[PDB]
Amino acid sequence: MTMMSGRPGRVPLQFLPNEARSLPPPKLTDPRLVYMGFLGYCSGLIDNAIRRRPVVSAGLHRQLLYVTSFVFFGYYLLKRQDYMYALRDHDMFAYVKSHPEDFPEKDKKTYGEILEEFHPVR
Amino acid sequence: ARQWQPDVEWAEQFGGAVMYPTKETAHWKPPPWNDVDPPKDTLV
Amino acid sequence: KFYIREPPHGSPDWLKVGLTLGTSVFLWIYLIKQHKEDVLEYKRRNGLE
Amino acid sequence: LQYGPLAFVLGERTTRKLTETSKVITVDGNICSGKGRLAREIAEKLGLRHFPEAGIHYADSTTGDGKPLDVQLSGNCSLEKFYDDPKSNDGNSYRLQSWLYASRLLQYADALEHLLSTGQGVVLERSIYSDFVFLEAMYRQGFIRKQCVEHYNEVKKVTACEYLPPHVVVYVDVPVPEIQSRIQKKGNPHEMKITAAYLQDIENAYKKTFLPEMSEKCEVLQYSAREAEDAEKVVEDIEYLKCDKGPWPDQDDRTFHRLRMLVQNKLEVLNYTTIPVYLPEITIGAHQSDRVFQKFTELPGRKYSPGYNEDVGDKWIWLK
Amino acid sequence: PTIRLQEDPDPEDENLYEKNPDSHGYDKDPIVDLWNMRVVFFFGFSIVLVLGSTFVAYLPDYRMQEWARREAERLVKYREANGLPLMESNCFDPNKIQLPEDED
Amino acid sequence: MLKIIIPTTMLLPMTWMSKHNMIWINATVHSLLISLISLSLLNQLGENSLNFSLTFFSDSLSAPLLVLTTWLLPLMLMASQSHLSKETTTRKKLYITMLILLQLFLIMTFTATELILFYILFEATLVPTLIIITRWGNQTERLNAGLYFLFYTLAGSLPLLVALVYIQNTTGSLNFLIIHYWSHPLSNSWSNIFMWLACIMAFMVKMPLYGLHLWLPKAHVEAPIAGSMVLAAVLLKLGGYGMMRITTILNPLTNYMAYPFLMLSMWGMIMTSSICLRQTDLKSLIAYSSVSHMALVIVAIMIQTPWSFMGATALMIAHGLTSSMLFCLANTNYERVHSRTMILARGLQTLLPLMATWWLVASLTNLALPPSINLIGELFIITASFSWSNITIILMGMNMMITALYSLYMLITTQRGKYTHHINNIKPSFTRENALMALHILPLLLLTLNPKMILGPLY
Amino acid sequence: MNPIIYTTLIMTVMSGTMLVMISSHWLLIWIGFEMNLLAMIPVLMKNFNPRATEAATKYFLTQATASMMLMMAIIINLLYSGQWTITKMFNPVAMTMMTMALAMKLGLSPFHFWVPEVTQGISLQAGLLLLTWQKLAPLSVLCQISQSINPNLMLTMAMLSILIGGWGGLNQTQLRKIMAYSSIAHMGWMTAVLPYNTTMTILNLLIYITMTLAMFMLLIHSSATTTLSLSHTWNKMPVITSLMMVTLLSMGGLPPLSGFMPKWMIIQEMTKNESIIMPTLMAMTALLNLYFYMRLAYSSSLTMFPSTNNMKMKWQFEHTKQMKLLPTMIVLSTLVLPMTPALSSLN
Numbered sequence A: 001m002t003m004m005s006g007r008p009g010r011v012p013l014q015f016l017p018n019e020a021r022s023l024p025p026p027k028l029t030d031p032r033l034v035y036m037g038f039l040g041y042c043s044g045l046i047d048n049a050i051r052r053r054p055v056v057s058a059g060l061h062r063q064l065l066y067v068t069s070f071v072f073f074g075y076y077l078l079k080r081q082d083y084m085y086a087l088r089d090h091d092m093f094a095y096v097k098s099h100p101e102d103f104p105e106k107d108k109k110t111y112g113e114i115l116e117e118f119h120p121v122r
Numbered sequence B: 001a002r003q004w005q006p007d008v009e010w011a012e013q014f015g016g017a018v019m020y021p022t023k024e025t026a027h028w029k030p031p032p033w034n035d036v037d038p039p040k041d042t043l044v
Numbered sequence C: 001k002f003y004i005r006e007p008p009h010g011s012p013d014w015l016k017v018g019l020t021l022g023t024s025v026f027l028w029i030y031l032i033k034q035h036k037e038d039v040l041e042y043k044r045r046n047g048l049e
Numbered sequence D: 001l002q003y004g005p006l007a008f009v010l011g012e013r014t015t016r017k018l019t020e021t022s023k024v025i026t027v028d029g030n031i032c033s034g035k036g037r038l039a040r041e042i043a044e045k046l047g048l049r050h051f052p053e054a055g056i057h058y059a060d061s062t063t064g065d066g067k068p069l070d071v072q073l074s075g076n077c078s079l080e081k082f083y084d085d086p087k088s089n090d091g092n093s094y095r096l097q098s099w100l101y102a103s104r105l106l107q108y109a110d111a112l113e114h115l116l117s118t119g120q121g122v123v124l125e126r127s128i129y130s131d132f133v134f135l136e137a138m139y140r141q142g143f144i145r146k147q148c149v150e151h152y153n154e155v156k157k158v159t160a161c162e163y164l165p166p167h168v169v170v171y172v173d174v175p176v177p178e179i180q181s182r183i184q185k186k187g188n189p190h191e192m193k194i195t196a197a198y199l200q201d202i203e204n205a206y207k208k209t210f211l212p213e214m215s216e217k218c219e220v221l222q223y224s225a226r227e228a229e230d231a232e233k234v235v236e237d238i239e240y241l242k243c244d245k246g247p248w249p250d251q252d253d254r255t256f257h258r259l260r261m262l263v264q265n266k267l268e269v270l271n272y273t274t275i276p277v278y279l280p281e282i283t284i285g286a287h288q289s290d291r292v293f294q295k296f297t298e299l300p301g302r303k304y305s306p307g308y309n310e311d312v313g314d315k316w317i318w319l320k
Numbered sequence E: 001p002t003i004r005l006q007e008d009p010d011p012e013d014e015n016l017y018e019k020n021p022d023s024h025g026y027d028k029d030p031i032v033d034l035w036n037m038r039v040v041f042f043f044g045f046s047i048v049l050v051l052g053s054t055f056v057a058y059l060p061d062y063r064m065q066e067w068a069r070r071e072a073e074r075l076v077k078y079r080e081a082n083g084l085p086l087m088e089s090n091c092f093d094p095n096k097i098q099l100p101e102d103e104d
Numbered sequence F: 001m002l003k004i005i006i007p008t009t010m011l012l013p014m015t016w017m018s019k020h021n022m023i024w025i026n027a028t029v030h031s032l033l034i035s036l037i038s039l040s041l042l043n044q045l046g047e048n049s050l051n052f053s054l055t056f057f058s059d060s061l062s063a064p065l066l067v068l069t070t071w072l073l074p075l076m077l078m079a080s081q082s083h084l085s086k087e088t089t090t091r092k093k094l095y096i097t098m099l100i101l102l103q104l105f106l107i108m109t110f111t112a113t114e115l116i117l118f119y120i121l122f123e124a125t126l127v128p129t130l131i132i133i134t135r136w137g138n139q140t141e142r143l144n145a146g147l148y149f150l151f152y153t154l155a156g157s158l159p160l161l162v163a164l165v166y167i168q169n170t171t172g173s174l175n176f177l178i179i180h181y182w183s184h185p186l187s188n189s190w191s192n193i194f195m196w197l198a199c200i201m202a203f204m205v206k207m208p209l210y211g212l213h214l215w216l217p218k219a220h221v222e223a224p225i226a227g228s229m230v231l232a233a234v235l236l237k238l239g240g241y242g243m244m245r246i247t248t249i250l251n252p253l254t255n256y257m258a259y260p261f262l263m264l265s266m267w268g269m270i271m272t273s274s275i276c277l278r279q280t281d282l283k284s285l286i287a288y289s290s291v292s293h294m295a296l297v298i299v300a301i302m303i304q305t306p307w308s309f310m311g312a313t314a315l316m317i318a319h320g321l322t323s324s325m326l327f328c329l330a331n332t333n334y335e336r337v338h339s340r341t342m343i344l345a346r347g348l349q350t351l352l353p354l355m356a357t358w359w360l361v362a363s364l365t366n367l368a369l370p371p372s373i374n375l376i377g378e379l380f381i382i383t384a385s386f387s388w389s390n391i392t393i394i395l396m397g398m399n400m401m402i403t404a405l406y407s408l409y410m411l412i413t414t415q416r417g418k419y420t421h422h423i424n425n426i427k428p429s430f431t432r433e434n435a436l437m438a439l440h441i442l443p444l445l446l447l448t449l450n451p452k453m454i455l456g457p458l459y
Numbered sequence G: 001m002n003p004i005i006y007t008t009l010i011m012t013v014m015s016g017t018m019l020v021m022i023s024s025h026w027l028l029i030w031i032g033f034e035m036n037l038l039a040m041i042p043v044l045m046k047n048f049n050p051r052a053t054e055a056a057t058k059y060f061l062t063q064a065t066a067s068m069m070l071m072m073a074i075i076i077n078l079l080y081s082g083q084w085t086i087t088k089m090f091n092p093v094a095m096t097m098m099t100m101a102l103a104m105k106l107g108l109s110p111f112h113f114w115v116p117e118v119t120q121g122i123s124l125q126a127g128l129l130l131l132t133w134q135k136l137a138p139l140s141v142l143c144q145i146s147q148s149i150n151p152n153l154m155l156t157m158a159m160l161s162i163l164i165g166g167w168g169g170l171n172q173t174q175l176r177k178i179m180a181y182s183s184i185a186h187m188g189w190m191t192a193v194l195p196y197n198t199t200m201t202i203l204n205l206l207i208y209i210t211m212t213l214a215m216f217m218l219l220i221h222s223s224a225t226t227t228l229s230l231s232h233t234w235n236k237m238p239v240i241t242s243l244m245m246v247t248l249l250s251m252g253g254l255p256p257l258s259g260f261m262p263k264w265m266i267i268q269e270m271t272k273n274e275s276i277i278m279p280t281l282m283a284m285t286a287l288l289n290l291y292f293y294m295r296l297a298y299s300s301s302l303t304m305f306p307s308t309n310n311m312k313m314k315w316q317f318e319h320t321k322q323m324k325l326l327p328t329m330i331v332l333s334t335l336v337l338p339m340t341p342a343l344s345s346l347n
Ligand SMILES: CCCCCCCCCCCCCCCCCC(=O)OC[C@H](COP(=O)([O-])OCC(O)COP(=O)([O-])OC[C@@H](COC(=O)CCCCCCCCCCCCCCCCC)OC(=O)CCCCCCCCCCCCCCCCC)OC(=O)CCCCCCCCCCCCCCCCC
Pocket: A042, A045, A046, A049, A053, A054, A055, A056, D303, F009, F013, F016, F017, F090, F091, F094, F097, F101, F104, F127, F128, F131, F135, G238, G239, G242, G243, G245, G246, G256, G257, G301, G302, G331, G334, G335
């Protein structure tokens, strides 16, 4: 029920191991970052609407801070997420390699020699 | 001609202590407006 | 128009506005610098450039 | 720094401002007695802030520009037509009484906020404590129903229990034939229609419920019609009162902090005035409600929060 | 009151033809109404209907039906010019199929 | 697919930043422009679908549905702006926003490459529709209608979610191309029987299948006019499209799992058509007619032949146009006399002649007059069903008769006879209403000239 | 209550939870629970009245019983292995006792009776705390000992929680009891996936806490605790009721809203472990929660209920206090489904 908590050589509260730096960072126009910025913009607009201020005009410094905070946090969130998926794939490939008797390569047939069952539609 | 909106009799379906009133919960009374019950005259 | 204090009057709080804009600007430059450093370290670790 | 928990923590206290002339004072009396002149004189002598009696448009005085709003957007009741047709089947009478109780509650909150924040005392004309005399008068004259009285009592039971009663209760006593004399000599064509039974009911409610009740937690100063033009003598009578009776000597900084957090935040004060009890006199249907609210939001300074209406000349909206 | 509530009376609906005898039924403002009519008619009947139907009518033969007809013509010419069957009941070459060897 | 999608999204702030008196003009103009751009998806390769990207693709099944959606939006705007005149600017913008969000969800659902994305968008269409019905619905009964529309739909679609995630765990993918190329037969087991049911029942309740159809008269009758238009024209077709996609992983089980659904659809075809003969409400009659037509589509999809799939596509498109036109026609009279009862206003041909012409043409396409595409679809389905079993002609033949009967009954009751003497507020037809009817009708007639466009992938 | 005292008590509640979360020793985890309860009882009675007293009394009795049981489980575990470290329980009987103790602390069915009563008896701020922060400690403990727990007991209590949350919520007009039954059903969802993937438990908890914070803050902003009192908010603050409508649909789990993500993730994980049947039941039963959310949205935002004359006076006053995080909470409660793959950062 806890697959990656017990992995060896894992620092308790890093959020970003040093090994993560071997991975390409997300581009600054990453559509997920753009969506995080859009979330910040919606937060700014709802903020204006709740306090009965003009919705698109009232606080531009405030809306800018909303957008910037969301983009800033989202960048690091994306880094950590991509790093965790890289760990998953690394471990899966290493395990398949070290246990070849569990992942055998069997000879595959062309469809000319596989007998498939035919079911007429009528 | 205008769109129908709830009136007092419609709104009062949601004013009881409970939805779906039965014979037992009929004598349940909704709590006070502020959450303050009148003090009891349990004279010590 | 209005009768009493109306704490935000005709002029805006320049302290709070300055601090908010400064926070946004600092966050953006920190993020740009962080992304530059990330790209360079990644290229260095794998021998791209 | 808006007053809150942080302001109370670092420094701010109430007791260090109370300076022996704080003394919430209310000057009651029947219709067309001279209680208003006496109240202004007491306030000017003792140096207290005066509050003219709360009317239908008291709330307008405190928000936006202090100008009154139209009657359909504010109040939705008429004191004149209560005098003309007190038994009208559109519920104007209890609507008026309930709106006036709400206005007096708002004014009591404003006066307590002034006192607790500046230490200076206040003088009120009537109160949420004496408001019920008109209700009982209307009910005995067949002007309102039993249900309206029950609703009034509910709202009062959940609202008036939150505040401290006044230190001094001044009652200007004028017999009802003198009252009628003053009414006819005034000139108001509507007030002419006030019967003698109505004024007698107001006076009976006063003298048998309000004064005996306030005399238990407040000290009462009664004055007949003639001995009430002597403002110096009344102020001398107040300066030599030993306020040792009510809940005010039982108040330390924490109870004052709770009260001061309540008396600001007018929405919290007015919370229980609109409880979902569906009396025909005060219930407004969805269509009229929607129309009147839309019309309110189109008033020249009311669409946005105070400092954000550029139609009224507000500036730097983008930067606020 | 013998009433239940303070409610506005249900209003009568207003005839757009009363203040504007030629009102097109789009809007109370006669100018906005006229321009709503014009934009609807131009962008629906002129742009989308006519030009769109023309565009769809002259769509290139990406479904490859002309190509298929010419291909079938080549095949038929070659096949009955050589005496070969027009079509074979086998879609795929039986020499590329390896059936299971024994059937009992 | 991005070229169609972004402008649709753009429509959102364009309407939120428009002047109070120009919202309808702006929305209508740019909706029509979007419809024109979409028109370019009808160019199809032949052998395979156009795959724009990993996330989106268009088919010959898909292209007709998208064009109908985009074309329906401006018509809904024309139909709405009359009864929404008294509304505040903000609420009018909110209504238009609901319609735009609905269009956006619909376009994406039809073009999503994989089933989980299709499921999410196919379910996201529920929120704007429910809000439209329950907030702008005229009657008190709208709240009940909204609940019926929601719950019937979710009770079918949640087992589909479970089945889909299970299928991706066992197969490794839900991408429709991989699903098709790696298809393997479904064995005859209890597990596979329940997988079949969980894959089919959501689309069955969307159609709706007879007996699970009770939500539709409620929801279609209690909705505002644009809500009814989109509910009949497009939202019913989600079930057909989803079933046509999903039945590729269900063979050969469909051969006998289809029997009860075929029985229900044929007999309930007869049933709902007969119901239309004794209906006192005019919207109720159009709703049940939609049910009868979708029963035919269910039969076509269940028998799984190329002719039946072609007929199903053609019938879906034709029904979408005709049913929307009939709802708009009923709404004009309702706007006049403020009642849905069919015998209230009579002899309207004497008072409104051009609207009577629109009524006649809509009634003629509803009964599938040749060579309209309604009859093309119906005839193809009937032929496929005949091949499936020669006894289906009796049921099919009976249905054709009852449909003619109630269509002409509606026409005769509302347009012919003498006018009710008391009603004197029947004003001449507005240009808006006539243009709305023409913009429904002209496209249908135009489609007869080029039948292959609405035929589908099998063609 | 002095503001400084209130701050000290909130800090003691939070520090007890953090002690439960950072400890390696069973005794320190027990001490964390004790400290949390000690500081939490006064926060329930902050606004004194008989109902708050009764709620705090029922809460104390339930939580202290759970505490005794928890300690007994720890001691039996020590008896059968000289171990104090919280890893996997050694004794099956100790594990049963521990599971039941933590279920009582969480309010899972059949131990669910206390949650609606205590929530109704306290203020909206204390209810917010009780239904958000008071779940972290037992859930973290359950996540640590997850391999040891028996699936049959856990899943029984989870399915009961979902069913009973739905059924009990159907009957309510008070908003605090509606929120409490909602919480019971949500806890059932969180614990159903626990023996399979604790990351799904954490994700469900985070999204539930976001939506619950948003709902409670919206209920405080429009100071309503009944259905009819919330029916007035349209005639004073329409934006608030629209935002509440959308938050209600997200709680229901309807796509494309965020609330749908936890349900979607949990069902998928379960199917991987060959468990088709449990999930089909869970979703079809969450339909009940959706029903009473929809009823509240009908009475509050989609229709307009009649109002009172005194509302005109409220029209003239702005809210004295504004919640800083309310806008962010609404956006995270509604518009976060496109960010679902970010759950990998939780493991
Ligand atoms: C999937 C495809 C893409 C989807 C996108 C995502 C979805 C949309 C985004 C969501 C968040 C954004 C908006 C949130 C803040 C809105 C709050 C608000 O009150 O709005 C009022 C405000 C207008 O108020 P006002 O101007 O001050 O004056 C009005 C009067 O004072 C009178 O005002 P009032 O306040 O007195 O009126 C009160 C009114 C106020 O009621 C509301 O405003 C409802 C707002 C609820 C917020 C929704 C929660 C968060 C969003 C979740 C969306 C879920 C989507 C999934 C499906 C669920 C459907 C909701 O309430 C009512 O009247 C009661 C009616 C109850 C009917 C039931 C409907 C309630 C729920 C409907 C939600 C539909 C979705 C949002 C639609 C857009 C709303 C702006 O809205 C705006 O004017 C701004 C809207 C956006 C403009 C910014 C555009 C960007 C800049 C333009 C350039 C374009 C950029 C690209 C560049 C291209 C190169 C050149």
